[PDB]
Structures are given as structure tokens and as C-alpha cells.
Design a protein around this ligand. Structure first.
Ligand SMILES: CC(C)(C)c1cccc(C(=O)NCC2(NC(=O)c3cccc4nocc34)CCCC2)c1
Ligand SMILES: CC(C)(C)c1cccc(C(=O)NCC2(NC(=O)c3cccc4nocc34)CCCC2)c1
Lengths: 236, 236
């Protein structure tokens, strides 16, 4: 149309992204030219014999950093290929927390460049001069930002035209009817779609309430949803 | 010793895990027999001609589910290979939030089995009969649980003996001294390691304070850390 999404990746390990470009939903999205994922490797932007990509930190210590020159130059080549208006994102443990709202924001960009850290990360000044936003997938210690980048790609790809609420899912049941002695809720077997709808929405709201209450803090629930939630809170 | 960690994976797309078994820190950990990652594919546990792995939900609707039989039987084969005492984890959007504390808990298990969902997920009753715990990497909509599983593997692998605080990092600086006109904080160039230590710890605490305050809510800071934080709060 062209609504195809383009995502550039800066990574020391571009072959990892096969995990999203060759498999599943994203893989089908790449096969049908709805998503293009392009990788540039800082290892290819070095000029010494040994293709060095780490550097010592000013101040000393054991924590190596990504070498500034090969990293910056990969970013620039990626910006040159994106053309005007690509948003550059540092997958960073000190970034803004990723959540579904954040995903919808990022999905509104047609060109993104993802920068994946290694070692203890990248020079602070590279954030000022090259990074537009910093995003984190959660508060845990990883060894690189590739997996966070792929998670991020997977989440945004669902907003690409041609690829196909905010609360937790209701329980799902498939065959068989009785599984190790455990039976499906009769309402789902009943065949009355209006009782099934009310139950599924009510169970969704109770799950959200019990297991992730904070997802409710930003919604104004519908009349029906407030009624079904109040019932479920009392029945508990 | 044997302290080698073993992680079984149940996935419709086992080839994705090459992204952690063939690259980086985890790849070195697999090459040196410190971590073993074994995959079983529900597609291999089917008995129809077309190797069907999805099923319709009781209650109707467009949301397909993982078919119970091939999934359950892959889990069982994985449990049989683990031997006594493997913890089975469903990577699930309705699970307990992953955070560094959670990672250290999970890293205390020598055998883990990771179950990765596809479609809208797995039968509720399979959680009662086969899943020990449910874990989520964050509040966003993905298309499968493989990437969450790999993130989880990456985080726990750092606790394997032979592979090598809780606050956000201080800013890092490497060469060059002046980068697009931006200079390194003089203290890092100074060569006095005691001033460098105090600065790095103080900047770490301010970052944590400003960008992720909630990481402070579970610590009793040291005398030095409380002093450096109070200073930084006033200087802001
Ligand atoms: C937050 C807290 C747990 C206190 C903490 C403190 C200090 C360091 C780290 C840490 O994990 N540093 C290592 C690196 N991690 C990530 O890149 C990374 C990690 C997590 C989510 C992410 N989302 O995008 C990129 C992410 C950074 C550069 C190389 C890997 C984490
Ligand atoms: C929480 C909220 C955003 C409201 C929401 C509501 C409803 C569905 C989904 C959703 O993403 N469902 C799809 C699946 N997602 C994940 O498996 C998954 C997603 C995120 C983190 C994870 N950590 O481990 C596995 C994870 C589940 C089965 C196939 C993929 C998310």
C-alpha cells in the first residue's frame, strides 16, 4: 500500500533474528513482504585486524563496553538505509518499561532501528547523540539486548496491516470434555452463545482483578463490565 | 561437579532456540557442557496424517488453542527425561511477573521444563495437572512463548557455576575522551579510584531513584548508599 513495516537491527549476533524472521507469525509476515528486518553487525564496521568490538571503560573495572566507533557507524549506515524519520531505540535495562500501551505507540512508526547492547552496554554519550528512546522489557539481568529486541518486534508486528482486549484472558478449554477427571464448565458446552459471552467476560475481569489488578487502573469499564466485576468480587 | 543446569523446552518451533544455544554467553555455556537445552515438539506427538497441533475451544470463537494430547505427551516425555524433581513452568501472560528476585528463585532449580504456548494458549486444566508455576516476562501481547522462554533461560544461565547489583547501572563511558563534543566526567579520567567508586555508586542510586524508584522499596540501603542518595536527591 505500502504499509509494510521496516525494522533495522544493530546487533553483534544478527543470526539470532532468524528466530523471528524464519518462524511463526513474524516469519509468515517476512515471507509475505509485510515486514522487513535488516541487520547490521558492528563487527563489520571495525578497522583493526582482529575486528574488536568491546572497549575498556574510563574509570577502570571489569565491565567491558561496546566499542563506540563500530557501533556508531553501524547505526549511521542503518539510518542511511531507513531514510528520513526512523526512530532509533536502545533496548536498555534503564529504559521506559514496555507495556501494551507502549507497544501501540512504537507500532505507529513505519521505520524503527533497534540497537541491541552487549557487555555492560553502550557509552552514555551515544544515547544523547544517536538514541531517540530507551525501552526495557522487564527488570531482570540479561546478557544482551537481542532477545528484548525480538520480543519488541513480535509485539509490534501484530499492528502491521495484513497480519490478521487489554485484560487477561478468561480460562480456555478444548478437547477433551473430561481431562484427567476435570470437566469443562457446563456453560461452554451449553451452546447458548449469550451465556458464554457473559461468562467469558466475567472470568476475564476476575482474573485481571486477582492476578494483575493494575491493568484496571487505566480503564473506564463498560456498564456491563462493572456489573460483572462487582458480582465476581462478591462471589470471591 | 555436576552443577550443569538442564532445561527442557516444549515448543512448536524448537529451531528458534538456536538463538540461545549457538550464540553469545549461553552458546559458550552450551559448548562447555555447563547448560543443556533439550527441545520436544508437540508436532512429533501427534497421530493424525496432518500432524494437527491446534484445536477449537469449547464455547466457539476464532481463538484456537494448543491441542491437548500432543502437548501433554511432549511434557510427559520431557518429565521422563528429567527424572525426579523437575519444575514445569508455563510461560504465560497470566503468570507471576518475572523480576530479578524471581530469576534467582528459578535459578535454584537444577532441572526446569519450559512450556511455550502458541495460538491463544493451552487448556486451563493442563495448568492444574501439569504446570507447577506460571511466569510472565511483561504485560504485552506476543504471538508465542518461545521468546519469553529464551529470555528466562538467558537470565537464569548467569547463576550456573562456571559461567563467569540490583540497582540500575551508573553511566558508562569508553573511548573517545570527547565524542561529538561531549566529554567524559573528569572524575573518571582522574585516576583516583576512591573518588571513582563514590561517584559510580552515587550515580547508580540517582538513576534507580529517578527511573525505577520501586527497586529501592525492597532494600535496606547501606550507610554509604543512604548518604550518597540523600546528597543526590538534594542536588536535583
Ligand atoms: C534493571 C536491573 C535488573 C536492576 C539491571 C541492572 C543492571 C544491569 C542489568 C542488565 O541486565 N544489564 C545487562 C544488559 N541487559 C539488557 O540489555 C536488558 C536487561 C533487561 C531488560 C532489557 N530490555 O532491553 C534490554 C534489557 C544491558 C546491556 C547488555 C545486557 C539489569
Ligand atoms: C497481559 C495482556 C497484555 C493483557 C495480555 C492479555 C491477553 C493475551 C496476551 C497475550 O500476549 N497472549 C498471547 C500469548 N502471549 C504470551 O505467551 C506472553 C505474552 C506476554 C508475556 C509473556 N510471558 O510468557 C508468555 C507471555 C499467550 C499464548 C500465546 C502467546 C496478553
Amino acid at each position: 500500500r505500502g504499509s509494510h513495516m521496516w525494522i533495522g537491527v544493530i546487533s553483534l549476533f544478527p543470526e539470532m533474528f532468524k528466530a523471528i524472521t524464519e518462524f511463526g507469525v513474524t516469519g509468515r509476515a517476512v515471507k509475505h513482504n509485510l515486514l522487513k528486518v535488516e541487520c547490521w553487525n558492528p563487527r563489520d564496521f571495525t578497522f583493526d585486524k582482529h575486528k574488536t568490538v568491546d572497549d575498556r571503560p574510563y574509570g577502570g573495572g571489569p565491565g567491558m563496553l561496546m566499542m563506540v566507533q563500530p557501533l556508531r557507524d553501524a547505526i549511521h549506515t542503518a539510518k542511511a538505509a531507513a531514510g528520513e524519520g526512523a526512530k532509533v531505540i536502545y533496548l536498555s535495562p534503564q529504559g521506559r518499561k514496555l507495556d501494551q500501551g507502549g507497544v501501540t505507540e512504537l507500532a505507529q512508526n513505519q521505520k524503527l532501528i533497534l540497537v541491541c547492547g552487549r557487555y555492560e552496554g553502550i557509552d552514555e554519550r551515544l544515547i544523547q547523540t544517536e538514541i531517540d528512546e530507551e525501552w526495557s522489557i522487564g527488570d531482570y539481568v540479561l546478557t544482551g539486548g537481542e532477545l528484548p529486541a525480538m520480543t519488541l518486534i513480535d509485539a509490534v508486528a501484530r499492528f502491521i496491516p495484513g497480519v490478521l482486549d487489554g485484560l487477561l484472558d478468561c480460562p480456555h478449554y478444548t478437547r477433551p470434555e473430561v481431562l484427567e477427571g476435570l470437566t469443562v464448565p457446563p456453560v461452554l458446552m451449553s451452546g447458548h452463545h449469550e451465556e458464554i459471552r457473559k461468562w467469558r467476560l466475567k472470568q476475564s475481569l476476575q482474573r485481571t482483578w486477582l492476578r494483575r489488578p493494575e491493568l484496571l487502573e487505566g480503564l473506564a469499564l463498560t456498564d456491563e463490565q462493572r456489573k460483572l466485576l462487582k458480582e465476581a468480587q462478591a462471589e470471591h
